[PDB]
Amino acid sequence: DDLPPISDIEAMFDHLVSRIPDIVELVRQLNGRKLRVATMCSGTESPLLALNMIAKAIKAQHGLTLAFEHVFSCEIEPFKQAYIERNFTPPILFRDVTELGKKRAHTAYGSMVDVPGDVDILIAGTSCVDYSNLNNVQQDIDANGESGRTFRGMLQWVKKHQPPIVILENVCNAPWDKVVEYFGQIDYDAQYTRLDTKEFYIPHTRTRVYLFATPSSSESDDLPEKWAQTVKDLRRPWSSPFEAFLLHTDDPNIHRARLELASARAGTSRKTTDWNRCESRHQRARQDEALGLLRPLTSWQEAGVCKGLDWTWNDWLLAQTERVVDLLEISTLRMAKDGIDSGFKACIWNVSQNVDRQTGSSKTALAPCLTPNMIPWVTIRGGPVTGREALALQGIPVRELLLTSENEDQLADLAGNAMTTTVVGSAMIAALKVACHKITEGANPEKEAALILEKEAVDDEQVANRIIGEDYLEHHDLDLAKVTKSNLSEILDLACRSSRHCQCEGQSGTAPNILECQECSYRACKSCGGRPEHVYAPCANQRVEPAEFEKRFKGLLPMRVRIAGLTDQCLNAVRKAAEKSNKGSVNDNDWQLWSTALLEGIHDAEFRFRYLKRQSTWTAVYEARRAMLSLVLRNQIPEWRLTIKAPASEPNNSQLRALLLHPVARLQIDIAGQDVLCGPWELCIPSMKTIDIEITGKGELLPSWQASLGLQGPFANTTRWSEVEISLQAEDENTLDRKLSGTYQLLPRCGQAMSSLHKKRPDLSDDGLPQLYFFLDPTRCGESREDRYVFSTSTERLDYGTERPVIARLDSHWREGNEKQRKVKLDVSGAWVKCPEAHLTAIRATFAIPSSASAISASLTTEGCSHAMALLSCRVPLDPTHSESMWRRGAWAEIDLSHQGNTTFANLAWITERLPPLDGLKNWAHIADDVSEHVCERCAPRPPKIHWIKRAFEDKLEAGQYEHALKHRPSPFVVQLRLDQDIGSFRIGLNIVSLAHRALSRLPPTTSEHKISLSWRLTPGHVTESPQPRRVFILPSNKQDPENSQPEAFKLPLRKEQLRSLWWMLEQEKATGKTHTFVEEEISESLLPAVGWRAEGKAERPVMVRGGVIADQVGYGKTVISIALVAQTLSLPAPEPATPGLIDLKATLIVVPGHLSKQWPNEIARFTGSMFKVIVIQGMKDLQEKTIAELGKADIIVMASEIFESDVYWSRLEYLSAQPREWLHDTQGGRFFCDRLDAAMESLVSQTKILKEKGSEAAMRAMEDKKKSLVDNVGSKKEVHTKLLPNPVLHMFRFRRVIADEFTYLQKKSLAAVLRLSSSYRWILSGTPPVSDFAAIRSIATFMGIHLGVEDDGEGDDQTQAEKFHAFREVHSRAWHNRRDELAQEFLNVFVRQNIAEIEDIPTVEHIHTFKLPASEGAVYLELEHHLQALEMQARKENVSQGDRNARLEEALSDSKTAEEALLKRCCHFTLDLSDKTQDAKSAQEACDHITSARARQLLACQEDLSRSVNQAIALHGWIKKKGGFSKNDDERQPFAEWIAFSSNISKHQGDIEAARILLKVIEKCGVKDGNIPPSPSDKQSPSIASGAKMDDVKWQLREQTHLLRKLVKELVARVRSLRFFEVVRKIQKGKSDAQIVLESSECGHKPSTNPDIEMAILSCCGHVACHKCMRKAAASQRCVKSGECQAAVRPTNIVKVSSLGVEGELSSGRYGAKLEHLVNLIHSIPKNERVLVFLQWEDLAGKVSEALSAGRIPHVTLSGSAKSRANTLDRFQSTNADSARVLLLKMNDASAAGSNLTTANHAVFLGPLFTNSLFNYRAVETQAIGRVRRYGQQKKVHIHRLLALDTIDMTIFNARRTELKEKTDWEEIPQEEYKGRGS
DNA sequence: CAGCGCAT
DNA sequence: TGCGCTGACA
Ligand SMILES: Nc1ncnc2c1ncn2[C@@H]1O[C@H](COP(=O)(O)OP(=O)(O)NP(=O)(O)O)[C@@H](O)[C@H]1O
Ligand SMILES: Nc1ncnc2c1ncn2[C@@H]1O[C@H](CSCC[C@H](N)C(=O)O)[C@@H](O)[C@H]1O
Ligand SMILES: [Mg+2]
Ligand SMILES: [Zn+2]
Ligand SMILES: [Zn+2]
Ligand SMILES: [Zn+2]
Ligand SMILES: [Zn+2]
Ligand SMILES: [Zn+2]
């Protein structure tokens, strides 16, 4: 609107200050003293930002300089004060605005400091949560509330300290006049005025009011009026849409916000919420507005299952609450009715409000009043405005502002209520201009000028002396013209072959399974695949990483061009020549304005290169100071497309911004050559002529966009011609290019704006041209009457700021209609011309490279953090014109990285490319030993120490100092550049030693003497392609090593494999010669992305660890090897160390699971009979009864591993350490317990060092005072404050060896303790070693002691967050992860040995028991399965009593955490009559008829309840009627009286129809019959009003009763829907005759009685029976078989084929489930000798299985109990004595199936197929379970059974896993016979 | 933290 | 024209 488009906050502020010059006269009044400003309530501290930008504009314009002195501010928020103290850091920060009235006010930290009152301007805004808050329905009144809390707090201070200016702000509807009375009551005068934001440069529309009051004046000059006039003087009304203020969808901010905002309501998605009371308003609105009950934008069924379009932020809508979504759809319809098309017209809605409160939409280019609770929906981007965009719609710049720990709710709150920085800037500047005099002077000017110059000088010296490596240079001369030769057809091929095939990829990478439509040419992923479904035949194309295509395309094209031209008169030649042809004669004014503005890009202003882009088809954009040129590189006819930039300051409605809007003078490449630029440069003159054009219709008449959309008003049944024939006259056609007179067909599927994509029918008058389309395209800002149809050759979404090439537009009056032979007028523009003879032609650079890496390695003496070792420096000639801003005329301007410095680097990339890559630095070079760690500060700041106060965490001030001292780290890869007199230069260098100190930082320190040794290297030309493979680790073998050939004193020999392994273990423990066995390092990266470099600095230290992980396949003798190792090593004298701290023993403790405590000593005694004493501990008491003098004798001690959780252990250790009584008392969690246990271990080792002398006391006594003195701190508390000896703790000794066993089952609480046990050699035994990923190897290393790397987030598939923040986090590349993998593989090669056992083979016959489920349980499980199918495999659990269908559910979904798990677990058990304990074997038919009878009872119960509620409501209504409340006039749509009109009309009732008939019968069986509104109820029961409270109260009670009615109606519909299905399945099972009876079809039309035998399938959730062909055809289109009367939402999934559930085999054995019943007969069939061991997986079924076996004549033994009992039961089950429990029930995935050496049994049962995800993990645990019986001492043949269901998921996952195994590695299948045992 | 609600 | 509040919910 007649104003220049302003979008940059800096520009609008310097404009603001440029409009008034009466402010520079302030800095003379201040006389050199800085303003002293204070702010009472300030969220984003918008006043401070405004003042800082005003100061910047002052210094930039007038040369002057005024500073500021923030005295204080206050915010009782928890995090807004954190944000303040991290950005501005004021000296004092109170937390209140009413305490400051006192002399000793409180501080945000609690210091209770005194208040300073030397302010110069106090700017504060009272809060709004009570000042009528028109969102809020409650309101506080008359100074009882806000004006007594905050305002009366502010008044006392402002009176007690008299600041010369105070400016207030609050909402419009406020008691302001009373505020003026309060202020003028004492001193002030206080005029107040209101003003919006949309009047100050910003489109935001939010409105507020301001106030200003200077202390009393003598003569009362009436300042506030002059203030108001000065403010309202300066204004400028929003010359730009909001889209200019939004971020582009590509930058990492938008990705980082979508990843967080996409999953807000998360493993199991939360419960289906309730909105019924608003659902009523939605239905009423859809009815009143004549809209149709569709859901266009998002075809949602439930809350979380929906499918937005392929341009919508789908991962947002999936997360939305359902009311929000339905509101989106009602807004779309209510808008699409008016004619405009949301989704193509930019405008912000508000959604967090209600349908009723949606006035003011259909209004574009203005945001609404942002509030912290709204959710705005842009409707054109298709998603919400994120945090930083909600900031930018205020004045606040997200730049230069550090937002750490800020989420979308927090950004919403901050930028929601903060006053617009431009409004506040203007009001404050007018204050400071009108009351300039009142502020005093400084009286010290020259000292201030000197201070300013001094600080500027030291800063300009710093960045200059940053670089310290100019010693070495070579000065290789540089040839900028580094073009190459290429066939230019293969490169266009490779350009088409590597380009964005979905919005998912986005300029970086590749996503698979692209679907390319046929006849529309629109590619898109399979995910987010088109809901506007196209033809979509799969795409056939290979994929080349964009990295390769860019690497070649750079080298192919020049780095600069310039259009030769000499076209001053060529334009007039072209004009006359074109006039000779037929084209619109151009005016004089248009020609002049166009030519004179074009003649500056043709001037010899050379084009540079920048940001070759990938959006689609790889445009490569060049740029000059005034023009822009960009080779398009289309997949057909590549062209160049020059364009000219309109000037900076020029209003929007200007002729030049119309003439230079579209490109001019394109050039089409000569294909099939070697030169990338050959064409003749045709031109585009501003010619605009109009032509008549006849439009006609053909083909049939498809439904219009309205009718297809679902409208029901006068739009229902409206059509449009399916094909259009365009007829242009001969000459008027042959004047222009791209003839148009063909015919165009419609594509209702291939969407566009208003679904009007007309693809031209192929014609052979031209083949060299691309395909042409004819559609609509709205303006996106202007009203929709002006939009027009258009002819173009492109069709896609366009981002703000880029237009599309069109051939011609059509009159703004023609629409797809019904009439034919309509004659309209087309208009052509920019009619091109023949080709001029102008063309483009391309065109002492020098760069320093380090000669060799030796020169550098000396310069970094020590503390290389202070300086930078220079790497490159390029001196390049640049003309003094068009030298960019970054080029500074002296003193080496510094570029900032990961900040505003990204266009700076993209500007000079034309020099960056074409530079030889640095070589000879690939190797790791520098080495310097740093014995101690001594982490360099400013490089690795110490974290705040977390301390315990509970019986605070992350001390505030320390957190602030941390998050500040992390942004001032040395920042490797510093890049500075400076422009000389002619030739500029820049110096890229990195702080090598900073990298090295950061790498050293990450090693955790030990009490050792091994010294680190740093390094460094720089590798060029790295690019990110994709994580294409996944590494698979390899565990070596122990075969090749020789053998020790015997251990002495064994009763039985070891085999040769075991001998080789024992010898390897001996040697590995010894390690003769070598002094360290492994090196561990943490390579730290720092990428300079734009140049191809990435740096790496490492820090490695050797570590001597003896012992390693032996993980041998099941059956091998790991126990035997360990006992042999102990027996062998026994004789040796002692190890190498000295162990002075704590006590050393000779015993070798073995940590085993709870139930192996009898298996281990038995094996030890069996092999070496009484060779050495072996003391066992199982219970805590067995530990406490021992003494150290007794442990000394013990050669080997066996320890159960649950004492570490016995929790008496932790108490006794709390005593030996002398800690508080509950220092180590923590719940199951082993977090925060590691630090506490570490401190306890330090204190314990000191105490034991003391106790070695027997001087027991006086130390535990000395530490109590230490702790109770340390506690005394000013922080947050709960209040003002607060030899031999029995029972030794095992953490105070040191053994010769510690051999864990089954280590991968050591849970958190006991892992965190076994990790601390101290010994010389530490061996680990396992059978299933986790080697899948890097975390599973790190978890092994931590047992060993190695570090082996730190934990990053990306390596996969709150406390310390200060280092996990996108501003303080690392960006570790892919090569980093590959090096970490190589390191894990090296550790595995060194310390891990797996090898195959070659004892002998075990027969291993296999069986399988598969059966069908009954009809009743079949139906139940099918209902559950279809539920989860329609919910997309996610567990969702869900007044009026629940039905039976919802009762079979909410029981399966109770504890299930995964969809597949609720199915594995359902098929097992099916108990009928869930309410009563009564039970007996009921036949199948009995079960089904019981189900159906219970459902009939439920239905009639709901019926009677509904009628009861109607009677109560009609009594209420008669009450109100007689008591004269509706007045029978001035209607207000009485709710109940309307619901009774709705319900009567049967055709209006959505949902099933039979339920509607039930409702009508029940309602007419009452006082209402054909809209009666009776006077009395049908029971004559009393209305239950309390005491006749009020009339409106009764109206409210009625308004609630009616919603209760409506809810009950929905519930009744569901009831009938479920009853029908169970009844029909009962009939299908009932018998053949009744099956024929019920097989009366859905009126589908055909059935076995009339037509031949046709498999006709029953549908679930409606109960309708129809033919499978009709069933599929109907369900695919999302509509039931009954056309428009079933009204149920149908998925293709829930289609149950008849006769797919069984009755045949009389499988009546539904007692305790039909699975567990088939188990018991099996177990009886097993002979009486053999033992059995069942393998269930889900613990929650142990009860049901032990209730089935028990009371099923079979006794068993479960392995549950305590650490003492499990060993005994396992021992008796292994034992030789007869008549134990025959079957033993094992839990899989539990420490009970760890390794048991039980071979008494010979066959498993293994009921439910294993579910676990990983195939390798599946295989490992299944072979472990099998091998539990297939062992060495077997002496028998083994069987394996399986109980799988034919219907369920069991057979599915069984087939998947078994086939995938049979294809993969050997895993030799088991013979698989069939069972005919029958032993009893 | 999702519903619910008409005025200065 | 709206810088929510208040019962339920994990
Ligand atoms: N040299 C040997 N002479 C006699 N028996 C042996 C010998 N080596 C192993 N065994 C027996 O072979 C069986 C193997 O069990 P064991 O080696 O203790 O299993 P594990 O490897 O510790 N557990 P797991 O593999 O997970 O099932 C035991 O009964 C051993 O006593
Ligand atoms: N004692 C107090 N009374 C009112 N608000 C307080 C307060 N202490 C802190 N606040 C916070 O201060 C804010 C009030 S409004 C602050 C924003 C203001 N428009 C500006 O930009 O300066 C709220 O976030 C509120 O939570
Ligand atoms: Mg074992
Ligand atoms: Zn298509
Ligand atoms: Zn995609
Ligand atoms: Zn350092
Ligand atoms: Zn149906
Ligand atoms: Zn049918």
Side-chain angles (χ1 to χ4, degrees), chain A residues 408-695:
Chain A
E408 314 318 306
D409 200 1
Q410 296 168 342
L411 271 303
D413 222 326
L414 287 153
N417 53 10
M419 37 180 85
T420 301
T421 77
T422 46
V423 163
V424 192
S426 93
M428 275 191 290
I429 202 177
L432 283 166
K433 172 254 177 172
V434 76
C436 61
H437 59 274
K438 195 170 280 193
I439 309 103
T440 77
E441 50 270 10
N444 191 26
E446 294 87 1
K447 172 57 195 63
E448 301 295 72
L451 197 171
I452 283 170
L453 180 80
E454 176 181 328
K455 189 261 284 184
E456 183 273 337
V458 67
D459 284 332
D460 281 28
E461 160 157 29
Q462 287 284 110
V463 303
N465 73 41
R466 191 79 55 86
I467 290 287
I468 208 66
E470 198 267 332
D471 293 332
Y472 44 85
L473 295 81
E474 318 310 313
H475 309 253
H476 298 351
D477 216 335
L478 182 52
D479 59 320
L480 304 159
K482 198 193 293 187
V483 311
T484 196
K485 47 160 167 290
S486 178
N487 207 237
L488 190 146
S489 315
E490 52 93 10
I491 195 59
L492 193 150
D493 182 314
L494 202 146
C496 165
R497 198 143 64 81
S498 66
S499 177
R500 203 170 62 179
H501 301 128
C502 185
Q503 293 271 43
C504 294
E505 315 202 350
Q507 213 260 319
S508 314
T510 282
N513 267 329
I514 309 304
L515 311 165
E516 166 160 344
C517 164
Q518 310 287 64
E519 87 192 344
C520 180
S521 286
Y522 166 84
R523 306 162 287 199
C525 278
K526 188 62 173 180
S527 200
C528 85
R531 181 184 162 278
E533 58 92 19
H534 300 254
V535 177
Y536 276 173
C539 180
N541 220 354
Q542 283 49 35
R543 293 311 300 278
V544 193
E545 282 325 60
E548 157 68 27
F549 170 70
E550 300 150 310
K551 173 259 162 187
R552 197 184 286 227
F553 197 31
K554 301 291 197 38
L556 179 71
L557 52 81
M559 199 35 84
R560 283 181 286 123
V561 307
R562 152 206 59 187
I563 315 298
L566 176 127
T567 78
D568 290 328
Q569 49 83 30
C570 165
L571 308 195
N572 267 306
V574 167
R575 173 173 191 171
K576 292 287 98 177
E579 187 54 82
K580 288 291 144 288
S581 86
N582 287 318
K583 58 91 180 178
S585 308
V586 54
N587 314 332
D588 79 316
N589 212 340
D590 307 2
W591 172 275
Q592 195 168 30
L593 278 153
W594 170 80
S595 42
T596 319
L598 172 55
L599 260 290
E600 286 73 1
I602 177 63
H603 166 273
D604 272 358
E606 67 210 273
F607 298 92
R608 306 203 200 275
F609 171 90
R610 46 196 64 161
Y611 87 101
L612 159 56
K613 70 184 81 149
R614 193 211 198 239
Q615 31 89 30
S616 168
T617 73
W618 280 108
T619 295
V621 52
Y622 291 103
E623 194 257 359
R625 59 169 298 99
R626 279 195 83 269
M628 263 196 163
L629 166 134
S630 57
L631 180 147
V632 173
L633 201 56
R634 276 199 275 207
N635 49 16
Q636 275 176 337
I637 306 100
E639 40 182 1
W640 278 94
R641 265 164 180 184
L642 164 66
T643 182
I644 307 303
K645 264 186 290 183
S649 64
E650 199 180 7
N652 320 318
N653 52 322
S654 51
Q655 290 260 353
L656 192 56
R657 271 163 183 275
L659 298 166
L660 293 180
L661 185 49
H662 279 328
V664 302
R666 84 209 201 262
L667 169 149
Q668 313 207 326
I669 298 312
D670 174 21
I671 81 163
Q674 210 184 59
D675 187 8
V676 181
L677 55 161
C678 292
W681 280 105
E682 68 245 32
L683 188 72
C684 166
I685 59 152
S687 59
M688 201 181 300
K689 64 198 289 308
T690 186
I691 49 183
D692 283 10
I693 167 179
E694 157 186 325
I695 294 283

Side-chain angles (χ1 to χ4, degrees), chain A residues 1052-1055 1058 1112-1120 1159 1163 1166-1167 1302 1327 1794-1797 1824 1827-1828 1831-1832:
Chain A
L1052 283 78
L1054 323 186
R1055 283 165 275 102
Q1058 299 189 207
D1112 296 331
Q1113 286 183 3
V1114 192
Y1116 199 40
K1118 289 175 264 288
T1119 306
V1120 183
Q1159 191 274 343
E1163 292 274 320
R1166 153 168 175 239
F1167 274 116
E1302 321 300 323
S1796 280
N1797 194 0
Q1824 180 186 12
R1828 271 293 91 43
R1831 289 285 278 271
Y1832 173 73

Side-chain angles (χ1 to χ4, degrees), chain A residues 1788-1858:
Chain A
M1788 206 193 297
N1789 286 320
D1790 181 301
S1792 280
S1796 280
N1797 194 0
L1798 55 91
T1799 46
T1800 311
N1802 56 6
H1803 52 80
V1805 165
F1806 197 84
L1807 53 90
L1810 182 87
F1811 169 61
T1812 195
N1813 45 6
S1814 300
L1815 176 60
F1816 160 72
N1817 199 322
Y1818 168 105
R1819 179 177 192 277
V1821 61
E1822 180 185 348
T1823 63
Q1824 180 186 12
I1826 300 319
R1828 271 293 91 43
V1829 68
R1830 165 163 78 176
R1831 289 285 278 271
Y1832 173 73
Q1834 173 62 272
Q1835 292 175 185
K1836 200 174 286 183
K1837 188 188 308 308
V1838 302
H1839 320 279
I1840 284 93
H1841 312 169
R1842 283 176 195 266
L1843 305 166
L1844 309 180
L1846 262 292
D1847 294 318
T1848 324
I1849 194 167
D1850 302 342
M1851 195 86 95
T1852 290
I1853 78 178
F1854 181 59
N1855 279 338
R1857 287 279 177 241
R1858 189 257 311 275

